Amino acid sequence: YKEKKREDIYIRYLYKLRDLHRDCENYTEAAYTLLLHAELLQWSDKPCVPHLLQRDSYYVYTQQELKEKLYQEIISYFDKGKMWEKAIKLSKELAETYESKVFDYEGLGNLLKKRASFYENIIKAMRPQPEYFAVGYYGQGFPSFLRNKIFIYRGKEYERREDFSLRLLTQFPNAEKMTSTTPPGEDIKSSPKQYMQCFTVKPVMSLPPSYKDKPVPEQILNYYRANEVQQFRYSRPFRKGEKDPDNEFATMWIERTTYTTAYTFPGILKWFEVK
């Protein structure tokens, strides 16, 4: 629909997906989708189209007001989504809007209360990192967008590889696991009987902007270890040279594999195709 640009139905299924993600309690992804909805709005006053005027409740809803409501909801989501950096980010513009357009200082006070709570949450506690796996779909029986495709999955905080592999097999019949983990199979680039392979990959460090030298505490960095990421690498053991008995470091040659996907975890989807 976005390709076809018919925005209203686009919003409709966007809300559908929001329902789905809430059912899954994937607060972050629901927040992102609802944000894509909110992104269409503006801080103007005139409600330009009733297309954005959805079916949930139907009256005037100036774009300003609806945008406010959406931002409040997304803030709540991120709050229970335990992702307070984006929460603070959005809180900043929301406070801007309150103080420069509507001048309701009560909203300022509540929002700043929440922002202080967010900063406290960032500094005080800690959060587990989700393991990231690479999924290579191969064969022909796979769906069109799945055949001979490779995805990266934002697994749970403590997904041992084979647990996630089991979950993926639950997603599929023909649950057979390949063993040449690195290279694909040319026969299976056309064969039926869908073939797959999974393995953990390394979340390549992001670039926290304006953070390159300041002696910042770890917490923000550990947050950047897993979140807001787009690069992923996987080391490749290889023997190259003589296999002398006492030594192996005369042959180690790592053929690392860097993976870039079009979007940045976390996203609307817990996975994404490698780009």
């Binding site: 393991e131 953990t200 080391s235 053991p237 470091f249 790592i254």
Partner: peptide, 12 residues
């Protein structure tokens, strides 16, 4: 490492 079987990288 959680690596692939037979694909561990031995450290020092």
């Amino acid at each position: 490492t959680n690596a692939f079987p037979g694909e561990y990288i031995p450290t020092v």
